[PDB]
């Protein structure tokens, strides 16, 4: 019951590793340091009537 | 013979003034004051005072 992911590696020049979960609890697992997504659309641009960035956005 | 603190924290750029540099027996709530070691100048964003707390240890003093 193993699962294979990719190792973090350099760019411009896909090596795999293995992981097996041994314990019965979800707090026992290793930390998930491979989630790189983001969404800064709720902190920047937190407005109504979404602006255009080419118009003056007033008058 | 009340509870007393230690010698105040020796900084590498600040030394004590001269009512405090000699005398022992620092009680609780006692404030001491530092001066710049002779060749240095003051950073105006930091206040050079140290209060001894209830657990007989001085407050945090870093670089005045």
């Amino acid at each position: 019951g193993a699962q294979v992911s990719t190792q973090k590696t350099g760019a411009h020049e896909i090596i795999h590793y293995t992981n097996i979960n041994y314990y019965k609890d979800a707090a026992s697992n290793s930390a998930n340091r491979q989630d790189f997504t983001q969404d800064p659309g709720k902190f920047t641009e937190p407005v109504k009537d979404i602006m255009v960035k080419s118009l003056p956005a007033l008058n | 013979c009340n509870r007393s603190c230690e010698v105040p924290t020796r900084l590498n750029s600040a030394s004590l003034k001269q009512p405090y540099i000699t005398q022992n027996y620092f009680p609780v709530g006692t404030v001491v004051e530092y001066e710049c070691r002779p060749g240095y100048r003051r950073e105006p964003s930091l206040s050079p005072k140290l209060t001894c707390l209830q657990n007989l240890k001085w407050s945090t003093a870093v670089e005045f």
Partner: protein
Amino acid sequence: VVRVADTMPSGPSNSESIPALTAAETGHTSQVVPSDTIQTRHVRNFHVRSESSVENFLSRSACVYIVEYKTRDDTPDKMYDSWVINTRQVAQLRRKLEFFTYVRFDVEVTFVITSVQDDSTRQNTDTPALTHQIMYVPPGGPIPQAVDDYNWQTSTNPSVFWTEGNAPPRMSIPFMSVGNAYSNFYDGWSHFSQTGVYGFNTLNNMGKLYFRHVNDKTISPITSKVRIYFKPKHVKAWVPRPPRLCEYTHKDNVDFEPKGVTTSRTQLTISNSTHVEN
């Protein structure tokens, strides 16, 4: 793998399109790409926002308190020691958690236990390997009062035994909270009449740890010092917060000495250096 955004090439422009002139009065951070004001080139960028994520920022084994207790003392209260569990007595991990307002994580806990032989006349002994017991008390349980108390018999409480010379103890603990997340900051009171105690001290309620030597009373005093290392993992955080400027004063409030904004300067413009000579 989510790379950073690239730079697209541009050229001259003479039009009614004004990316520079914005209104910062609308609570709005402008989104001016560097290809919108100057002429740029095609740069295929390979940078990864990996080690700035919340998991990569918080999942380090920080330190929270030091605990000292002896194995032969005349007073029975220094033969064991306790600590009510908070994360607010060391400023580094406290400030890193106070980047965020609500957090939710599991804790991986490590103890680093060191013993020092104290000073006595009969200092030449032949002592076997010391054994430590680290007992956790959930909030409300019975508390020990001596080293030979029968409250240490750990029938329900999780307790960890360790022999001197091995690897340090390590155990994980799940999300032990009654709310939907932890609270770093709580602006309220304990009693419904808006009296009582103010702040985050109402929401700690974590129980406490107890430490003793499993061995009997030795013939020479040995002090032991145990360091609790919390290490958060499986972390989520909500509603961020400006980082704290002033220095902390206590563990049960946010009270402070007023510090200025930053380090000072001598004048408001810059120029070349006015030091020694050519």
